[PDB]
Amino acid sequence: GMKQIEMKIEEILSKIYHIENEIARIKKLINLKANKADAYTKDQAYTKTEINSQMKQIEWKIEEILSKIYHIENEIARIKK
Amino acid sequence: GMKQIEMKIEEILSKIYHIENEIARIKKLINLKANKADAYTKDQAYTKTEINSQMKQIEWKIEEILSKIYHIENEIARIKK
Amino acid sequence: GMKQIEMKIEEILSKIYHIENEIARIKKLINLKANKADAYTKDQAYTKTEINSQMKQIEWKIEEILSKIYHIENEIARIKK
Numbered sequence: 001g002m003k004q005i006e007m008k009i010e011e012i013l014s015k016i017y018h019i020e021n022e023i024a025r026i027k028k029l030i031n032l033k034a035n036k037a038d039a040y041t042k043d044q045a046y047t048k049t050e051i052n053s054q055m056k057q058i059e060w061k062i063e064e065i066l067s068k069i070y071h072i073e074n075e076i077a078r079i080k081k
Numbered sequence: 082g083m084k085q086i087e088m089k090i091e092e093i094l095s096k097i098y099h100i101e102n103e104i105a106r107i108k109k110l111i112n113l114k115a116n117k118a119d120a121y122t123k124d125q126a127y128t129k130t131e132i133n134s135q136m137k138q139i140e141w142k143i144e145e146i147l148s149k150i151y152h153i154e155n156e157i158a159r160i161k162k
Numbered sequence: 163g164m165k166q167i168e169m170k171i172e173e174i175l176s177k178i179y180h181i182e183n184e185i186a187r188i189k190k191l192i193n194l195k196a197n198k199a200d201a202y203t204k205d206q207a208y209t210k211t212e213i214n215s216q217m218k219q220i221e222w223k224i225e226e227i228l229s230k231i232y233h234i235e236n237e238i239a240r241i242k243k
Contacts (some may be wrong), residue, residue, distance in 0.1 A: 033114040033195040
């Protein structure tokens with residue numbers, strides 16, 4: 001009767017010890033996660049793809065400008081002769 | 082006396098099982114967090130706003146260049162004529 | 163015999179209450195970590211250094227364009243008189 005209670009107490013202690021270990025483990029796993037305060041969210045940042053597309057847009061305008069410059073240099077050389 | 086111990090044992094078993102469930106749940110919530118090792122910190126990356134401001138600066142120079150080009154094309158058409 | 167069981171019961175109650183508190187704490191610490199769903203990984207985004215290098219490349223083409231534009235403006239002024 002009393003020994004049956006002792007066996008159940010031992011059982012409980014074991015389950016508690018397991019729980020304490022799961023908690024110690026969880027605390028360490030938490031330490032490996034990035035804090036909201038030190039990381040930008042998706043709404044605050046562009047992806048590589050998005051940046052790539054914006055850079056192409058600029059490169060295009062620059063190509064347009066260079067081709068206009070080259071055409072103007074040719075016109076000037078014709079006027080000169 | 083012994084029944085009072087049994088009641089308390091039942092109470093403890095219930096709590097333990099609730100605790101175990103809270104822990105299983107916590108483990109799942111941890112798995113949805115990003116690791117420090119796989120995410121850039123705020124000092125490593127620019128925000129959308131910062132990129133937008135850098136792109137604007139460039140777009141504004143490009144506009145200035147295009148307006149100079151349009152002016153030059155006009156001068157050249159006058160010289161020719 | 164019965165008092166030895168009571169002592170062990172007291173010990174278990176104490177630990178459980180501590181555990182419940184550690185869990186409440188842990189839940190709050192978890193809320194401060196960034197979710198995988200709201201953060202980009204390192205391979206999805208460019209760093210400041212990488213963006214800086216792409217912006218330099220563009221600035222160099224712009225410098226080249228400006229000097230050509232300045233030279234062309236001078237030629238045009240000479241042709242005019």
